[PDB]
Ligand SMILES: O=C(O)CCC(=O)C(=O)O
């Protein structure tokens with residue numbers, strides 16, 4: 316529910332953060348996923364496949380489980396289920 | 401009612417002959433016209449605009465009127481009227 | 486500033502158009518290629534009735550007038566390009582492209598991407614129009630407008646276009662009357678809001694999942 | 698063959714497919730670009746119902762799989778590409794294009810034309826689908842099949858494709874039942890003939906003039 320305009324692909328929405336870098340996806344049925352990095356230049360988009368985006372949010376859930384709050388973990392897990400399951 | 405396949409534009413139909421070069425047009429509503437030339441290599445297409453194709457068939461009608469048969473002139477004039485008027 | 490794209494051999498030119506002004510009419514020579522910089526351009530087919538069918542609603546960074554790349558100035562346009570909003574763009578006569586590309590071949594790839602993108606966008610409108618349920622077809626279209634023209638807003642994504650029911654009708658092969666009714670149903674189902682001819686779609690992500 | 702297109706830096710490969718065989722499925726990496734050499738490739742969107750909508754019916758010399766030009770192998774296909782007839786084509790992994798173009802820049806222009814043509818073809822299907830009269834929409838589609846796949850024949854242009862009423866339905870956003878009825882009407886009006894699942898359109902030029 317945070318958003319970003321790709322110059323070619325139009326409106327994207329954030330699936331989740333990582334650290335720094337963020338995962339975004341296309342509004343229309345998530346046909347494309349993008350790894351996004353910000354900087355003083357600065358915003359850059361790298362496409363990535365659905366299976367790799369899945370493993371990315373999976374890794375992130377593992378890190379939240381070990382090192383962060385239950386709330387964040389529970390939020391991200393709901394996002395995982397709505398995005399991938 | 402003689403036909404020719406353009407590699408890009410698909411089926412074309414002949415509007416008329418000139419002398420050994422021919423005028424063809426796109427099947428779907430004549431959005432494009434093509435001057436066509438044949439050879440031992442050999443078939444080549446040059447696009448031309450509707451106003452210039454019109455003047456071409458016009459010139460051709462003038463030549464048929466002066467130097468060829470009534471039948472050919474009458475055939476081409478019908479083609480002129482169905483293509484341009 | 487974007488005019489850093491231009492050069493001695495890509496002598497591009499800026500054109501601006503007030504809302505509703507024509508960029509090219511059917512019958513005009515296909516002399517130029519266009520890059521839409523800001524605004525929305527409507528490409529349409531006009532029939533003898535005066536009925537108009539919208540073939541594309543283009544967003545910023547869209548390449549158009551691509552017939553010029555096949556025929557050049559010799560052939561005539563068969564679509565109306567109009568500035569749906571105020572529009573700013575770069576024009577270049579197409580003959581200047583060959584020597585442009587030879588010099589900055591980075592232009593070719595950029596161009597190939599831009600045309601590839603056009604292909605995928607038109608195919609999505611085909612998907613939209615192929616729906617038999619007229620409501621499905623409207624939602625799908627509004628989801629495309631959210632993608633192309635949407636702004637985050639308190640309640641969801643607002644399609645940042647002031648849309649007449651006629652303009653919508655002409656883009657989904659429907660009638661003005663059928664658009665009004667279907668928009669009404671969508672509001673009553675609490676899926677969209679309408680304010681000042683702007684449609685806000687409340688949960689465009691969740692709506693799209695119902696199309697898979 | 699035409700494999701004179703290939704080189705050290707465009708290491709293209711020939712693939713052939715028997716009728717009804719898949720060229721790529723949704724979910725496959727968008728690794729390659731394709732040039733259709735002979736035959737007809739159907740690009741479609743598959744929904745969860747198993748309902749299929751045809752997004753393109755491509756003829757020889759069509760470039761497709763163009764998403765690869767935007768994302769490469771990283772992104773996944775979302776259309777089904779199938780060999781509608783037996784098909785022969787050239788494949789190349791897309792990464793090989795940059796260094797290909799740098800070496801034979803004649804490839805870029807050829808490519809730009811091919812993609813431009815795709816844009817114009819999809820836009821004509823949009824025109825087709827935008828018709829509210831379902832018969833108008835069928836005629837317009839058959840006129841496009843005449844252009845893309847037609848053969849001169851004693852009686853007019855024969856669309857050189859064996860077409861199920863379902864295949865037509867999937868391309869014009871209709872139903873199998875409605876196609877049958879409309880084809881029936883067309884035959885009764887002496888506008889088409891049907892023999893061995895091939896449709897012959899008697900006067901495709903004169904029919905098109907009624908769409909202007
Ligand atoms: O670029 C497009 O989609 C518009 C078609 C076009 O190029 C033209 O009418 O010249």
Ligand SMILES: O=C(O)CCC(=O)C(=O)O
Nearest residue numbers: 761762763764774775776
């Ligand atoms: O080339 C096309 O039109 C098909 C779209 C495509 O490239 C893909 O799904 O990868």
